[PDB]
Amino acid sequence: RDCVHTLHSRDTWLKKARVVRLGEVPYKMVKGFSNRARKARLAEPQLREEND
DNA sequence: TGGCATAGATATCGCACGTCTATTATCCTCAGCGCAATCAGCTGTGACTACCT
């Protein structure tokens, strides 16, 4: 479990008063969902998985 | 007598079927500007009268 870690978006990290370091690799590329993003993904499902 | 298949008995994990509160950028309102026919005051012009010759 100590090797299992929780993650947040860069915007959510900033909300948590955290700034991602330069060049940091994405620990998890996952589904992205925001108002404009959600509507765009509903427009076409091919990029719903491709957002990451 | 003894090796073990063959199904009775039983859970067991996977696929599928219900809710739930938010990994992140809206909807009306009042004050601030604008545009077009009167109306009035600044300025020009004529009528009346003062002054140098």
CA triplet A35, A37, A42: central angle to 5 degrees? 95
User: CA of A34 and C1' of B2: distance in angstroms?
Assistant: 73
- Give the C-alpha distances (Å, rounded to integers) separating A30 from A8, A12, A34, A48: 10, 14, 13, 10
Experimentally, the structure was elucidated by: cryo-EM
Chain centroid to CA A39: 16
Collect all residues with Cβ–Cβ distance below 8 Å to A27 and sequence separation of at least 6: A5, A7
- Asked whether strand B has any atom less than 7 Å from the CB of A33, the reply is yes
Nearest to A51 by CA among A37, A43, A39, A42: A37
Experimental resolution (Å): 4.0
Report residue A32 as tokens: 């992205």
> How many whole angstroms separate alpha carbon A4 and alpha carbon A47?
28
- Asked whether strand B has any atom less than 7 Å from the CB of A30, the reply is no
Give me the count of residues in chain A. Answer: 52
> How many whole angstroms separate alpha carbon A29 and alpha carbon A25?
10
Containing A36, the helix (H) or strand (E) segment is helix A35-43
